[PDB]
Amino acid sequence: LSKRDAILKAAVEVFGKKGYDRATTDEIAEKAGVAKGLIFHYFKNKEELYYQAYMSVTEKLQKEFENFLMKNRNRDIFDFMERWIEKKLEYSASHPEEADFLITLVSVDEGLRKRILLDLEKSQRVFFDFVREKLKDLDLAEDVTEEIALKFLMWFFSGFEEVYLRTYQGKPELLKRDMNTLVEEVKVMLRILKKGMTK
Amino acid sequence: VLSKRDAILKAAVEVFGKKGYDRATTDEIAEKAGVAKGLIFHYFKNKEELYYQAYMSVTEKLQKEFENFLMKNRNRDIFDFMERWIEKKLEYSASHPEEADFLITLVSVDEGLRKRILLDLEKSQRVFFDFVREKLKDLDLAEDVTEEIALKFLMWFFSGFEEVYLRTYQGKPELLKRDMNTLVEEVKVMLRILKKGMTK
């Protein structure tokens, strides 16, 4: 682990534990075992240190997804999304530091938040292209257009995300306990969407 | 012809929605209401209690609407019921943009006030989901669809819908009205999807 990656790892930890405003770069330096000045050497400032840590974790989740897609790209779209969500949930239960960090975007400077949100869209494009490509392969039911199927899926995914955050954020042991229940619920809900959207 | 107290709540809804909590003044509101400024504080301790009461009067409006719906369109099939409810909710939201603007300000408000108001909004649609919960017991659910899974699914889907709706149309009644047709059609189709996917 280079000093730059140890700094980024330390920043993920400290930012997630203290939030963006209470976290100091001193704390991050010590946690990384590096000299305070090196943070400013590798990152212009606290904003940019936060940005690049955000990018770095977003990068790991992209590789996670590229691996999974490659392995699972031939599955039915609903089977694919079910397995992906189960992978996502398992990642978060084993990566509580990264999960706590990701949620601090909320608390951040307006411009930083904007810059990061636009980068989040770019990082996920391949997922959303794949999804809408695969929705074009379904024999959709009467009056279900691809745009409708996709809106539905997004409304649903957003709702689920909200409940995940409301219920499991900062509670990795609770997510582990509930993991079988969540994965089963999700399998069934996507089966519902499958049965109702297709003929 | 509104009482002064209610004329004041109405004006408050208008002024707060237009200017936001911080820039809105009781002077603006008293002028919008047609009353003396002293009458506002006579009826409402201050601006925060005025915002609270204005917020309650709107949510009581909305909830009255649901409770009439519930007993008129009561024992319809639940998916038809829900489809129709969501259509009413949309038509109202389009015709009451001052209320929409107003509701939206809750983000920018003092935390105590915002929690206080959130508790009351939790209550506010228990009626809806208690009814849905009971109506699902009537249904012949598809294999593996438990009633618990059924209800969680409807909750998660409506929350997500709501969230994306707010993000899209917040401060855009022009986009909303332009989009209405498409949105209504989407709702009909999506609830047909739910009925077919959820029942045997």
Measured between beta carbons, which residues in chain A are less than 8 angstroms from residue B195?
A: 196
Tell me if chain A has a CB within 8 Å of the CB of B179. Answer: no
Tell me: do B17 and B78 sit in the same domain: no
Tell me: do B36 and B107 sit in the same domain: no
Q: Which of B105, B89, B91 is nearest to B55 (CA)?
A: B105
How many residues are there in chain B? 200
Tell me: do B183 and B197 sit in the same domain: yes
- Would you call A142 helix, strand, or coil by DSSP? coil
Q: Where are the alpha helices (DSSP H) in A1-109?
A: 3-22, 25-32, 36-42, 46-72, 77-94, 96-102
Tell me: do A167 and A73 sit in the same domain: yes
For the domain that residue A188 is a member of, what is the CATH number?
1.10.357.10
Q: How far is CA B1 from CA A76, B4, B5, B7, B41, in A?
A: 61, 9, 12, 9, 22
Q: How big is the CA angle at B106 (ends B105 and B112), to the nearest 5 degrees? A: 140
Tell me: do A18 and A98 sit in the same domain: no
For residue B66, the distance in angstroms to the closest alpha carbon of chain A comes to 22
Tell me: do A40 and A60 sit in the same domain: no
Tell me: do A109 and A151 sit in the same domain: yes
Tell me: do B38 and B58 sit in the same domain: no
Tell me: do B111 and B195 sit in the same domain: yes
Which domain does B42 fall in, by range?
Answer: 1-46
Tell me: do B89 and B12 sit in the same domain: no
> What is residue A140's DSSP assignment?
B
User: Which of A188, A197, A199 should one mutate to test binding to chain B, selecting the residue with the greatest count of B CBs within 10 A?
Assistant: A188
Tell me: do B14 and B69 sit in the same domain: no
Total number of domains constituting chain B: 2
Resolution stated for this PDB structure, in Å: 2.3
Output A34-41 pairs: Cβ under 8 A, ≥24 positions apart. A34/A3, A34/A6, A34/A7, A38/A3, A38/A7, A39/A7
For the domain that residue A22 is a member of, what is the CATH number?
1.10.10.60
Q: With an 8 Å Cβ cutoff, are B145 and A188 in contact?
A: yes
Tell me: do B37 and B92 sit in the same domain: no
Contact by Cβ (8 Å): B98, B13: yes
End-to-end CA distance of chain B: 53
Sequential DSSP letters for chain B: ---HHHHHHHHHHHHHHHHHHHH--HHHHHHHHTS-HHHHHHHSSSHHHHHHHHHHHHHHHHHHHHHHHHHHSTTS-HHHHHHHHHHHHHHHHHH-HHHHHHHGGGGGS-HHHHHHHHHHHHHHTHHHHHHHHHHGGGS-BPTT--HHHHHHHHHHHHHHHHHHHHHHHTT-HHHHHHHHHHHHHHHHHHHHHHHHHHB-
Q: How many CB pairs under 8 A join A and B?
A: 81
